[PDB]
Amino acid sequence: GSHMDAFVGTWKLVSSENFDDYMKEVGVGFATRKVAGMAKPNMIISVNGDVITIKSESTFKNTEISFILGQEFDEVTADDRKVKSTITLDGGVLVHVQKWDGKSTTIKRKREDDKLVVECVMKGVTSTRVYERA
Numbered sequence: 001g002s003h004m005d006a007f008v009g010t011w012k013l014v015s016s017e018n019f020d021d022y023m024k025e026v027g028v029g030f031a032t033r034k035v036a037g038m039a040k041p042n043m044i045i046s047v048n049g050d051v052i053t054i055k056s057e058s059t060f061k062n063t064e065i066s067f068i069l070g071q072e073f074d075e076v077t078a079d080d081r082k083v084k085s086t087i088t089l090d091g092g093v094l095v096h097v098q099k100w101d102g103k104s105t106t107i108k109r110k111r112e113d114d115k116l117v118v119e120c121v122m123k124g125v126t127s128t129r130v131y132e133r134a
């Protein structure tokens, strides 16, 4: 077992706040904001050895990343940014930093009660997206 295993499973989005504003700050265009903002993703998190896989599945896109904690990787995001990503596990929180074009956004994933809470930050704008087990 590992501490990280409280994230493993299949999660469904139950609430979102300020996601349109977060996407605007990231630079997402109008049409993608509208369709992606309507999405109700499931988040599938699995661990096999040192490799963590996180999939976001929705009517908009199916996206999947696999990574080792602390080891940078190239990621194509749902809005088609080509970013350099590093994910670490710091005090029980998965911290995902994406770098591109001299910009940075950080996505934190935390367990709180029976929720998995995703906090997304860009240039002072936060979105909070709350998931529960499927």
Ligand SMILES: COC(=O)c1c(C(F)F)nc(C(F)(F)F)c(C(=O)O)c1CC(C)C
Binding pocket: 022, 023, 026, 028, 032, 036, 037, 039, 040, 041, 056, 058, 060, 061, 077, 078, 079, 107, 120, 129
């Ligand atoms: C900048 O926004 C994104 O990168 C993004 C977009 C959007 F860019 F298209 N759409 C979606 C989804 F709702 F469509 F799934 C997600 C998501 O996984 O929730 C994300 C990831 C984000 C919550 C950190």
